[PDB]
Nucleic acid binder design. Structure first.
Lengths: 222, 159, 185, 172, 51, 58
RNA sequence: AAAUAUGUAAGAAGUCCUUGUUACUUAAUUGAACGUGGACAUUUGAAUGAAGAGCUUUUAGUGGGCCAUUUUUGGUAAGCA
RNA sequence: GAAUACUGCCAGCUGGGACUGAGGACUGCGACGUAAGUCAAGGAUGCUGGCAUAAUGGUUAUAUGCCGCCCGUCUUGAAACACGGACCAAGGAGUCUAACGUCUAUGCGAGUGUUUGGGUGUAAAACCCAUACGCGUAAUGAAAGUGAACGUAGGUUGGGGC
């Protein structure tokens, strides 16, 4: 009766209920994702059948990566990059797409490559390079208890809860994204695909909105 | 030599508007200014007394004093690496109420009324403004709107 | 390379220890370091930081100031705490029975407090009696009453004392100080 | 950007309360990817109507595959391009098996013969020539004769090794 | 002491996300889609084939 | 002999290294430039308010 | 009559209700300024960030500048001014 | 009616190569297990061989590959066709003092300062001391002069701690 196993069994039981909760929430997220994607697919098909065109809802999330070094930057784009927390090359963050942030993206276009990230990209990014800002420190997530301790007051109890709040831009996206430390990506493993980076993606360069190819770029950078 | 008189470089800024010369209409003098009111400064060139210096044209400040024919305005002026408080005695011909602050005051009233109705029904009435959101999905119908195909046009001289 | 938004390697700018070499002050600091780590009372942290301050940042606290503090409602039975010196004051003629914890008591202050039926005690006695600062009242002396502060911020129309050795007529009371001699400030 | 695909891009002005259902303008755009295709769409819509990307919306973008991508076709192309000293209109004929491959050949040929970069070329029209006697350029006409056959004199064989032991031949 | 990558090291991958075993057991990464025989409208076909 | 006459070069960088700071407003601003009649009467108004509050609080 | 650049606001030092002070003001128990009481978390009133924020004292060196894009003056021009 | 390309996804499987092995009782999160337990799960272990010394390694000379202009100084700009410097040893330049500012340490504290002097001494030391004097405890005015509580030494806003 030394209270070792008496408290360890209680802690193990509490961990069991936490994992049961996480399991059910992740399953519900998986059905929600599948239903969403299948629903847009069938919406396009049904609009075709009816003779209409289905215009997809505009994207709510962008991933932005700084692709330019820190020297010789004008003050306004330098300030915007600091406010987006892109203070070194190959740093990346998520941005919720509104008019206010779209004007920032326009203002830093020659120094970043951005686009609309897919669920695979977000999941791999947070699983590989996810770090929490806890007490001003860069803390590797590596466990669901850390996320519960710093984000559980918003209902985020797991790394999949965090990913869900990112992918569907939820009510507490600001807090979840700010909790995420800016991602430190590497140079792309097969290169940039272009001779010269510092033209617009449209003109055969790297910067600007490359909307759906940001997934390929980030996978190579991750 | 150089010249830096009080009204130097004001040739166009102190003009009267085109076909808007002469007597100032009485709405300027019928206005009521209280301490704490936020006002814009725009000099009227036909009233040479109580006139602001050219730096304050377009500046917006707070009334701190009310006299017989003038108001005192606080203005923040950037000098060197900091801001300094400047007190201006301006005749009412050179100022006007800030419409921005007017609309903020009715926005405050609307916020109170929304909260009062939400106390009855519909809690969490979303009082904060939001930026323009990305648009949602939509069905565009071709019925009576068959797409017209455009192409670039060849070059012509026009002369 | 990283676009630094703030100065790197910036020291916090606060004393983490007394600059003095007093072994007894260091023992007091050891006690309140332990107390501020192992208790959640903000009083212990306040006392620990006050033990670091310099002489000008611990102005003397008079017994008149102590009596005025004990005049506050509900403060009659509180333990007065002065991280510094308690000095004597002959302007005041009556004292209540009270307990004062301080670094130092002047002979006059100690005699007056003891004569009033009170007791003078060191900060470790305070730590033993009130480990969480129970029922205490921290008093601090006037910092800007120092003579050096008279001259801080000297400038035209600022109304500060000029740094001057001799005082009187013929010593900086002329041109610059009155309208009849040039201008006034 | 000469991994060319063809897209139909349909867009419109944003619906308003006074004017719902705008007129749904459509373009055929040759481009390497959908992002460039939408960029070209807004570029041409800005240049022909009073509609910029901010006041409009892309309703549909679809890749158009060649209907018979494995039959040799004669293509007539109308272009306008900018030279160093003016703008010009041009007509060319390309014999090839698909529209995208004809347009790739067109861009390479305009770069080679007129130093005309992609920036400087508007493809006015690409249309299959239905029948012969409408082809007007001899470099396409000469490949349309009966029982065509020609040799390829002077064959040059690639050598994988630095030294050969045989003093090779060019027969073919 | 060491960050261990999920997406490899199945042990850490399953310490996080207990649902991963159910995902890999039901083969949710290769979900067969239902069959639908929806046909685009003729007007869509002519619009696409235009010019 | 001759040197540079003037330039504002680097001056904005200097001004922004220690930032451009706002005047740090307060509650109860100073009654400087306020009309003397106003503040003369305001003194008596505050005095009466304090006296009435003291009487009400006994 | 642009583009770029630029002032201000986006709330608790607030809003509302009631009634207290004055020697100012009102024809007036009209106002003005400052208040006593009372009612106001999911969002305390747009976004993003915040690296701690605010404040003080004291003192070094410097007070020959020059170059690039863009705007621009004199000059034919200049690695000119 | 199908295939295939292209694009995308898999918490699909699997082979080859390189660099790294930080930490040092246990504690955590998990996984496989009916359990006992085991594990790739909060950082390398197991098995084997040769040598046990110039073998590895250090130092040094040389060779090879690539790179490397002469320092100091004034200056926007120095390798400069700018100035000083052939070489070496020894010497060679922010000191002391009077009066001060800020900061800090110390003693005492409405006071403070023994050392002009006197007393004393193991004799330029140490130890002890009266009356004064300096600064501080009151300011202001040119000066004659006058000289700091209406009040719980005031009201209001904020304010650590209690």
């Amino acid at each position: 009766a030394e209270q070792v196993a008496a408290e360890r069994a209680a802690r193990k039981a509490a961990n069991k209920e936490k994992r049961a909760i996480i399991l059910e929430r992740n399953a519900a997220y998986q059905k929600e994702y599948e239903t969403a994607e299948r629903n847009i697919i069938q919406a396009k098909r049904d609009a075709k059948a009816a003779g209409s065109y289905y215009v997809e809802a505009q994207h709510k999330l962008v991933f932005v990566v700084r692709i330019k070094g820190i020297n010789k930057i004008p003050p306004k784009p330098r300030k915007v990059l600091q406010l987006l927390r892109l203070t070194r090359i190959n740093s990346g963050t998520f941005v919720k797409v509104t008019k206010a942030t779209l004007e920032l993206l326009k203002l830093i276009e020659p120094y970043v490559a951005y686009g609309y990230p897919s669920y695979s990209t977000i999941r791999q990014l947070v699983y590989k390079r996810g770090f929490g800002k806890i007490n001003k420190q860069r803390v590797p997530l590596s466990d669901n208890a850390i996320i519960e301790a710093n984000l559980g007051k918003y209902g985020i109890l797991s790394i999949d809860d965090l990913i869900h709040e990112i992918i569907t831009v939820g009510p507490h996206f600001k807090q979840a994204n700010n909790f995420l430390w800016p991602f430190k990506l590497s140079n792309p493993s097969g290169g940039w695909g272009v001779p010269r980076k510092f033209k617009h993606f449209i003109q055969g360069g790297s910067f600007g909105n490359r909307e759906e190819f940001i997934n390929k770029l980030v996978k190579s950078m991750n | 030599g150089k010249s830096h008189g009080y009204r130097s470089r004001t040739r166009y800024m102190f003009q009267r508007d085109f076909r808007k010369h002469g007597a100032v209409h009485l709405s300027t003098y019928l206005k009521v200014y209280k301490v704490g009111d936020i006002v814009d400064i725009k000099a009227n060139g036909s009233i040479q007394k109580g006139m602001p210096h050219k730096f304050y044209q377009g500046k917006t400040g707070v009334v701190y004093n009310v006299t017989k024919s003038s108001v005192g305005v606080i203005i923040n002026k950037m000098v060197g690496n900091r801001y300094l408080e400047k007190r201006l005695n301006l005749r009412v011909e050179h100022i006007k109420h800030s419409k921005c602050r007017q609309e903020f005051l009715e926005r405050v009233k609307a916020n109170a009324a929304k909260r009062a109705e939400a106390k009855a029904q519909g809690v969490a009435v979303q009082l904060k403004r939001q930026p323009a959101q990305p648009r949602e999905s939509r069905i565009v119908s071709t019925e009576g709107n068959v797409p017209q195909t455009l192409a670039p046009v060849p070059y012509e001289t026009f002369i | 390379g990283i676009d630094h938004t703030s100065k790197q390697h910036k020291r916090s700018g606060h004393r983490t220890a007394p600059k003095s070499d007093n072994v007894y002050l260091k023992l007091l600091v050891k006690l309140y370091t332990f107390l501020a780590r192992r208790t959640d009372a903000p009083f212990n942290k306040v006392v620990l930081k006050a033990l670091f301050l310099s002489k000008i940042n611990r102005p003397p606290v008079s017994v008149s100031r102590i009596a005025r503090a004990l005049k506050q409602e509900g403060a009659a039975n509180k333990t007065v705490v002065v991280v510094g010196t308690v000095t004597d004051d002959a302007r005041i003629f009556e004292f209540p029975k009270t307990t004062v914890a301080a670094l130092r008591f002047t002979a006059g202050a100690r005699a007056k407090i003891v004569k009033a039926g009170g007791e003078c005690i060191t900060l470790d006695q305070l730590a033993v009696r009130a480990p969480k600062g129970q029922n205490t009242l921290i008093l601090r002396g006037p910092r800007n009453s120092r003579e050096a502060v008279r001259h801080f911020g000297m400038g035209p129309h600022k109304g500060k004392a000029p740094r001057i050795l001799s005082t009187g007529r013929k010593f900086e009371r002329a041109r610059g100080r009155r309208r009849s001699k040039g201008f006034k400030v | 950007m000469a991994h060319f695909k063809e897209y139909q891009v349909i867009g419109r002005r944003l619906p308003t309360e006074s004017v719902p259902e705008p007129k749904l303008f459509r373009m055929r755009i040759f481009a390497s990817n959908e992002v460039i295709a939408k960029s070209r769409y807004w570029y041409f819509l800005q240049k022909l109507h009073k509609v910029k990307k901010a006041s409009g919306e892309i309703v549909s973008i679809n890749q158009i595959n060649e209907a018979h991508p494995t039959k040799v076709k004669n293509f007539g192309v109308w272009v306008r391009y900018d030279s160093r000293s003016g703008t010009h209109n041009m007509y060319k004929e390309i014999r090839d098996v698909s529209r995208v491959a004809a347009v790739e050949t067109l861009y390479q040929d305009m770069a080679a013969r007129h130093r005309a970069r992609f920036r400087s070329i508007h493809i006015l029209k690409v249309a299959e020539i239905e029948k012969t006697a409408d082809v007007k350029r001899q470099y396409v006409k000469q490949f349309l004769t009966k029982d065509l056959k020609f040799p390829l004199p002077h064959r040059v064989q690639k050598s994988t090794k630095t030294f050969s032991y045989k003093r090779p031949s060019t027969f073919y | 002491v060491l960050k261990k990558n999920p997406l490899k090291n199945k042990q850490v991958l399953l310490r996080l996300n207990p649902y991963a075993k159910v995902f890999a057991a039901e083969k949710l990464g290769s979900k067969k889609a239902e069959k639908t025989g929806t046909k685009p409208a003729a007007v869509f076909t002519e619009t696409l084939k235009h010019d | 002999a001759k040197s540079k006459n003037h330039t504002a070069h680097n001056q904005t960088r200097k001004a922004h290294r220690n930032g451009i700071k706002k005047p740090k407003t307060y509650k109860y601003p100073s009654l400087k430039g306020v009309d003397p009649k106003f503040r003369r009467n305001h003194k008596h108004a505050l005095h009466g308010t304090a006296k009435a509050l003291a009487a009400a609080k006994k």
